Design a protein around this ligand. Structure first.
Ligand SMILES: Nc1nc2c(ncn2[C@@H]2O[C@H](COP(=O)(O)OP(=O)(O)O)[C@@H](O)[C@H]2O)c(=O)[nH]1
Ligand SMILES: Nc1nc2c(ncn2[C@@H]2O[C@H](COP(=O)(O)OP(=O)(O)O)[C@@H](O)[C@H]2O)c(=O)[nH]1
Lengths: 168, 168
């Protein structure tokens, strides 16, 4: 029943930073007497219980067996690039296309995120990213994990996209 | 075709340390003109191409949707405890039992690893661990990522267990 969110994108774009900040602000301790220690942590976003996973394909993950499994399991995807890393923006399309193939679906809940919007060394313009999101039919949000701008907004937006998809 | 190895165990036992050390010693750059950049890194152990994944269930992973997927995908498991952490040893049985349920199999290639054997603050005796491995019918090896003792031996042993299982 939980909303299954997957954060995906190139290395070093801030996927871990964004996810850690989200957890810090949204984790709760839940009483559950059907488990050994009687309490478990969960993340609740916009009234919805959420599971969170990060899909990397670089570094250690260039050796993983699990890429396609993450894409099959995930329900909605936060597609992250960094606004000072043109290659990370170019890499978005590959991840989206892979997700659609693995899920065998034209309709998958996604949000495009341009992270590191605090930085002055921008090489990806807001309009380039807007154009990409418009083509996909999805929201685009600029965020900063460093300055804590729109981090919550990005995850809330994805939760809404999943909720809408579940109504279809 | 690749051998799919999963490293599993409690938090802080040295799963990342062991895996990083293995990769450092066994990664190769492979020529493959069917991919964009023409080269990809792979890990080769005992002549076998291997994929590597780490299954954690604590910390960030207490929020994951992926536990059972790791267990279904993995072919052989390196079940790690630390010899200065009695709880991590007690936790092994739960992981093994979960793996067997998810895989719906009584026969799964595994190796039991007691890591941190460099430490003088031992609370898990070699004989306790030997007894557990004997019950399961699997090898037991003590390792140290810090002093680089038997790290390669642990992964080679698991590769042999998988190879034997593939012959059945
Ligand atoms: N300036 C800035 N740095 C960030 C931001 N988010 C992450 N970083 C830094 O970018 C690097 C990569 O972040 P990380 O979370 O490890 O990225 P991942 O590899 O995508 O998980 C780290 O040094 C972070 O501190 C951000 O919004 N602004
Ligand atoms: N003394 C000692 N420390 C180790 C050894 N392996 C890992 N560590 C330390 O134990 C801690 C946890 O290791 P880590 O690889 O992060 O464990 P994981 O959470 O199971 O992936 C870190 O501080 C490591 O440096 C070992 O063989 N000996």
């Amino acid at each position: 029943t939980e909303y299954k969110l997957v954060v995906v994108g190139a290395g070093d774009v801030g996927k871990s930073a964004l996810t850690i900040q989200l957890i810090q602000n949204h984790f709760v301790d839940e009483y559950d007497p059907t488990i050994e220690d009687s309490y478990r942590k969960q993340v609740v976003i916009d009234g919805e219980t959420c599971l969170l996973d990060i899909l990397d394909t670089a570094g250690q993950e260039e050796y993983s067996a699990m890429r396609d499994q993450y894409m099959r399991t995930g329900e909605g995807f936060l597609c992250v690039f960094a606004i000072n890393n043109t290659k990370s923006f170019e890499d978005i399309h590959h991840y989206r296309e892979q997700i659609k193939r693995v899920k065998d679906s034209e309709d998958v809940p996604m949000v495009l995120v341009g992270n590191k919007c605090d930085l002055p060394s921008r090489t990806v313009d807001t309009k380039q990213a807007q154009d990409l999101a418009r083509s996909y039919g999805i929201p685009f949000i600029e965020t900063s994990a460093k300055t804590r701008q729109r981090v919550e907004d990005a995850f809330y937006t994805l939760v809404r996209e999943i909720r809408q998809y579940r109504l279809k």
